[PDB]
Swiss-Prot record:
Protein name: Carbonic anhydrase 2
Alphabetized PROSITE patterns for the sequence: ALPHA_CA_1 (PS00162), ALPHA_CA_2 (PS51144)
Species of origin: Homo sapiens
Reported regulation of activity: Activated by X-ray, histamine, L-adrenaline, L- and D-phenylalanine, L- and D-histidine, L-His-OMe and beta-Ala-His (carnosine).
pH effect on activity, per entry: Optimum pH is 6-8.
Length: 258
Protein backbone atom coordinates (compact mmCIF):
# COMPACT_ATOMS: atom_id res chain seq x y z
CA UNK A 1 -0.46 -1.80 -2.02
CA UNK A 2 0.00 0.00 0.00
CA UNK A 3 2.96 2.42 0.11
CA UNK A 4 3.61 4.59 -2.91
CA UNK A 5 4.82 8.03 -3.84
CA UNK A 6 1.59 10.05 -3.80
CA UNK A 7 0.55 12.65 -1.26
CA UNK A 8 -1.38 10.08 0.64
CA UNK A 9 1.01 7.11 0.75
CA UNK A 10 4.41 8.63 -0.04
CA UNK A 11 7.67 8.98 1.88
CA UNK A 12 6.14 11.04 4.73
CA UNK A 13 3.77 8.14 5.51
CA UNK A 14 6.09 5.17 5.25
CA UNK A 15 7.18 5.28 8.88
CA UNK A 16 3.70 4.17 10.07
CA UNK A 17 4.15 0.68 8.56
CA UNK A 18 7.97 0.69 8.38
CA UNK A 19 9.25 2.38 11.52
CA UNK A 20 12.89 1.92 10.42
CA UNK A 21 12.07 4.91 8.13
CA UNK A 22 13.22 7.04 11.06
CA UNK A 23 16.30 4.84 11.73
CA UNK A 24 19.96 5.55 12.14
CA UNK A 25 21.21 4.61 8.65
CA UNK A 26 18.49 5.61 6.16
CA UNK A 27 19.02 6.48 2.55
CA UNK A 28 19.28 8.51 0.45
CA UNK A 29 21.32 11.38 1.90
CA UNK A 30 22.73 14.63 0.74
CA UNK A 31 26.44 14.32 -0.14
CA UNK A 32 28.15 17.42 1.16
CA UNK A 33 31.21 17.32 -1.01
CA UNK A 34 33.33 19.58 1.23
CA UNK A 35 32.63 17.34 4.28
CA UNK A 36 33.25 14.00 2.53
CA UNK A 37 36.86 12.87 3.05
CA UNK A 38 39.16 11.04 0.67
CA UNK A 39 39.79 7.59 2.07
CA UNK A 40 43.16 6.18 1.00
CA UNK A 41 42.20 2.76 2.53
CA UNK A 42 39.62 2.24 -0.23
CA UNK A 43 40.85 -0.58 -2.54
CA UNK A 44 40.15 -0.22 -6.26
CA UNK A 45 36.49 -0.63 -7.28
CA UNK A 46 35.86 -3.54 -9.70
CA UNK A 47 32.71 -3.53 -11.87
CA UNK A 48 32.73 -6.81 -13.81
CA UNK A 49 29.69 -6.95 -16.02
CA UNK A 50 31.10 -8.75 -19.06
CA UNK A 51 29.03 -11.89 -18.53
CA UNK A 52 25.85 -10.20 -17.27
CA UNK A 53 22.72 -12.03 -18.29
CA UNK A 54 19.62 -9.84 -18.33
CA UNK A 55 16.31 -11.68 -18.42
CA UNK A 56 13.25 -9.50 -18.10
CA UNK A 57 11.96 -5.98 -17.50
CA UNK A 58 9.04 -5.53 -15.03
CA UNK A 59 6.81 -2.55 -14.14
CA UNK A 60 6.31 -3.18 -10.42
CA UNK A 61 4.01 -0.20 -9.82
CA UNK A 62 6.82 1.96 -8.34
CA UNK A 63 9.52 1.79 -11.06
CA UNK A 64 10.67 -0.72 -13.66
CA UNK A 65 13.28 -3.33 -12.86
CA UNK A 66 15.66 -4.89 -15.39
CA UNK A 67 16.33 -8.28 -13.81
CA UNK A 68 19.43 -10.48 -14.19
CA UNK A 69 20.17 -14.14 -13.90
CA UNK A 70 21.97 -14.28 -10.53
CA UNK A 71 22.12 -18.10 -10.22
CA UNK A 72 25.86 -17.97 -10.82
CA UNK A 73 28.72 -15.57 -10.38
CA UNK A 74 28.41 -13.56 -13.59
CA UNK A 75 28.03 -9.79 -13.15
CA UNK A 76 29.68 -8.79 -9.91
CA UNK A 77 30.82 -5.74 -7.98
CA UNK A 78 33.93 -6.01 -5.74
CA UNK A 79 36.58 -3.80 -4.28
CA UNK A 80 36.18 -0.27 -3.00
CA UNK A 81 34.59 -0.42 0.40
CA UNK A 82 33.34 -3.99 -0.13
CA UNK A 83 34.61 -7.10 1.55
CA UNK A 84 33.70 -9.94 -0.78
CA UNK A 85 31.70 -10.46 -3.92
CA UNK A 86 28.36 -8.88 -4.64
CA UNK A 87 26.23 -10.25 -7.45
CA UNK A 88 24.08 -8.04 -9.67
CA UNK A 89 20.36 -8.90 -9.42
CA UNK A 90 18.53 -5.92 -10.93
CA UNK A 91 18.70 -2.28 -11.83
CA UNK A 92 16.03 0.40 -11.83
CA UNK A 93 15.72 4.18 -11.82
CA UNK A 94 14.08 6.99 -9.89
CA UNK A 95 13.04 10.10 -11.74
CA UNK A 96 11.07 13.29 -11.61
CA UNK A 97 8.16 15.01 -13.28
CA UNK A 98 10.56 17.84 -14.29
CA UNK A 99 14.25 17.85 -15.09
CA UNK A 100 15.08 19.71 -11.94
CA UNK A 101 14.19 16.79 -9.62
CA UNK A 102 14.18 13.02 -9.58
CA UNK A 103 17.40 11.84 -7.95
CA UNK A 104 17.39 10.39 -4.45
CA UNK A 105 20.91 11.29 -3.42
CA UNK A 106 21.81 14.95 -3.82
CA UNK A 107 25.21 16.57 -4.21
CA UNK A 108 25.58 19.79 -2.22
CA UNK A 109 21.75 19.78 -2.30
CA UNK A 110 21.68 19.57 -6.17
CA UNK A 111 18.98 17.23 -7.43
CA UNK A 112 19.62 15.45 -10.72
CA UNK A 113 16.89 14.52 -13.18
CA UNK A 114 17.08 10.82 -12.30
CA UNK A 115 19.19 8.20 -10.57
CA UNK A 116 20.09 4.67 -11.65
CA UNK A 117 20.49 1.96 -8.98
CA UNK A 118 22.35 -1.28 -9.79
CA UNK A 119 21.51 -3.63 -6.95
CA UNK A 120 23.88 -6.37 -5.81
CA UNK A 121 23.79 -8.92 -2.97
CA UNK A 122 26.65 -10.31 -0.96
CA UNK A 123 27.24 -13.91 -2.10
CA UNK A 124 28.51 -15.00 1.33
CA UNK A 125 24.78 -15.07 2.40
CA UNK A 126 23.75 -17.45 -0.37
CA UNK A 127 20.54 -15.72 -1.57
CA UNK A 128 19.08 -12.19 -1.73
CA UNK A 129 16.47 -12.87 0.93
CA UNK A 130 19.18 -13.88 3.46
CA UNK A 131 21.41 -10.95 2.42
CA UNK A 132 18.68 -8.48 3.38
CA UNK A 133 18.83 -9.64 6.97
CA UNK A 134 22.51 -8.59 7.17
CA UNK A 135 24.15 -5.21 7.76
CA UNK A 136 26.50 -5.84 4.77
CA UNK A 137 23.98 -7.77 2.68
CA UNK A 138 23.68 -5.40 -0.29
CA UNK A 139 25.70 -2.97 -2.40
CA UNK A 140 23.93 -0.49 -4.60
CA UNK A 141 25.85 1.42 -7.26
CA UNK A 142 24.11 4.73 -7.81
CA UNK A 143 24.54 6.86 -10.96
CA UNK A 144 23.06 10.26 -11.55
CA UNK A 145 21.34 11.23 -14.81
CA UNK A 146 21.33 14.74 -16.19
CA UNK A 147 19.47 15.84 -19.31
CA UNK A 148 21.57 16.72 -22.36
CA UNK A 149 22.93 14.36 -25.00
CA UNK A 150 21.27 10.98 -25.43
CA UNK A 151 22.78 7.91 -23.78
CA UNK A 152 22.94 5.33 -26.57
CA UNK A 153 23.04 2.38 -24.18
CA UNK A 154 19.80 3.48 -22.55
CA UNK A 155 17.75 3.46 -25.76
CA UNK A 156 17.00 -0.24 -25.72
CA UNK A 157 15.40 0.28 -22.28
CA UNK A 158 13.47 3.27 -23.51
CA UNK A 159 12.07 1.52 -26.43
CA UNK A 160 10.59 -1.43 -24.46
CA UNK A 161 8.74 0.85 -21.99
CA UNK A 162 5.76 0.95 -24.35
CA UNK A 163 5.21 -2.73 -23.64
CA UNK A 164 5.28 -2.46 -19.86
CA UNK A 165 3.22 0.66 -19.36
CA UNK A 166 1.28 -0.49 -16.34
CA UNK A 167 1.88 -2.20 -13.03
CA UNK A 168 2.42 -5.96 -13.31
CA UNK A 169 3.39 -5.96 -17.00
CA UNK A 170 6.71 -7.54 -17.95
CA UNK A 171 8.61 -8.26 -21.17
CA UNK A 172 11.55 -10.34 -22.26
CA UNK A 173 14.73 -8.30 -21.94
CA UNK A 174 17.67 -10.55 -22.76
CA UNK A 175 21.11 -9.60 -23.97
CA UNK A 176 21.14 -6.09 -22.43
CA UNK A 177 24.63 -4.81 -21.50
CA UNK A 178 24.48 -2.70 -18.32
CA UNK A 179 27.96 -1.38 -19.09
CA UNK A 180 26.31 0.96 -21.52
CA UNK A 181 24.77 2.85 -18.58
CA UNK A 182 28.02 3.74 -16.82
CA UNK A 183 29.93 7.07 -17.05
CA UNK A 184 33.61 7.18 -17.95
CA UNK A 185 34.95 7.67 -14.44
CA UNK A 186 34.38 5.34 -11.49
CA UNK A 187 35.23 8.05 -8.89
CA UNK A 188 32.67 7.60 -6.09
CA UNK A 189 31.40 8.43 -2.64
CA UNK A 190 30.39 5.66 -0.23
CA UNK A 191 28.49 5.37 3.02
CA UNK A 192 26.40 2.81 4.91
CA UNK A 193 22.63 3.15 4.35
CA UNK A 194 19.39 1.48 3.48
CA UNK A 195 16.93 0.58 0.78
CA UNK A 196 15.20 3.76 -0.32
CA UNK A 197 11.77 2.13 -0.64
CA UNK A 198 9.88 0.09 1.92
CA UNK A 199 10.88 -2.04 3.68
CA UNK A 200 13.77 0.51 4.03
CA UNK A 201 16.10 -2.20 5.37
CA UNK A 202 19.47 -1.07 6.65
CA UNK A 203 21.64 -3.49 4.68
CA UNK A 204 23.21 -1.38 1.95
CA UNK A 205 26.70 -0.18 1.23
CA UNK A 206 26.02 2.72 -1.08
CA UNK A 207 28.55 3.55 -3.81
CA UNK A 208 27.49 6.70 -5.65
CA UNK A 209 29.42 7.70 -8.73
CA UNK A 210 30.49 11.26 -8.96
CA UNK A 211 30.20 11.58 -12.74
CA UNK A 212 26.60 11.71 -13.99
CA UNK A 213 25.56 10.14 -17.30
CA UNK A 214 23.76 12.34 -19.79
CA UNK A 215 20.44 11.23 -21.22
CA UNK A 216 18.26 13.14 -23.64
CA UNK A 217 15.09 14.97 -22.82
CA UNK A 218 13.32 12.52 -25.16
CA UNK A 219 14.59 9.53 -23.24
CA UNK A 220 13.48 10.81 -19.82
CA UNK A 221 10.15 11.97 -21.30
CA UNK A 222 9.45 8.32 -22.11
CA UNK A 223 10.17 7.29 -18.56
CA UNK A 224 7.48 9.79 -17.54
CA UNK A 225 4.86 8.06 -19.74
CA UNK A 226 4.90 4.90 -17.62
CA UNK A 227 2.08 4.35 -15.17
CA UNK A 228 1.95 3.52 -11.47
CA UNK A 229 -1.50 2.01 -11.91
CA UNK A 230 -2.57 -1.36 -13.37
CA UNK A 231 -4.21 -1.78 -16.76
CA UNK A 232 -7.80 -0.59 -16.94
CA UNK A 233 -7.26 1.69 -13.92
CA UNK A 234 -7.20 5.48 -13.94
CA UNK A 235 -3.97 6.75 -15.22
CA UNK A 236 -1.35 7.92 -12.73
CA UNK A 237 1.87 8.85 -14.47
CA UNK A 238 4.97 7.21 -12.98
CA UNK A 239 6.85 10.34 -12.06
CA UNK A 240 8.50 11.59 -8.84
CA UNK A 241 9.24 8.08 -7.59
CA UNK A 242 12.10 9.28 -5.36
CA UNK A 243 12.62 9.52 -1.60
CA UNK A 244 14.10 12.81 -0.35
CA UNK A 245 17.38 12.94 1.52
CA UNK A 246 17.33 11.61 5.08
CA UNK A 247 19.33 12.61 8.15
CA UNK A 248 22.97 11.64 8.02
CA UNK A 249 23.07 10.86 11.79
CA UNK A 250 26.30 9.23 12.86
CA UNK A 251 27.75 8.63 9.44
CA UNK A 252 30.72 9.74 7.39
CA UNK A 253 30.74 9.79 3.57
CA UNK A 254 34.04 8.74 2.12
CA UNK A 255 35.44 9.79 -1.27
CA UNK A 256 37.46 7.46 -3.51
CA UNK A 257 39.29 10.38 -5.16
CA UNK A 258 41.56 13.20 -4.01
ZN1 LIG B 1 16.45 2.60 -6.08
Amino acid sequence: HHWGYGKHNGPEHWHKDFPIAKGERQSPVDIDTHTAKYDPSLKPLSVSYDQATSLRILNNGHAFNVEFDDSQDKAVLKGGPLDGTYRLIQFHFHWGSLDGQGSEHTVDKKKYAAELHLVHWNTKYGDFGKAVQQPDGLAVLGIFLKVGSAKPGLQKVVDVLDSIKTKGKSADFTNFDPRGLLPESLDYWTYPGSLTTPPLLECVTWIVLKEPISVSSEQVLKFRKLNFNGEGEPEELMVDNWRPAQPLKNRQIKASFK
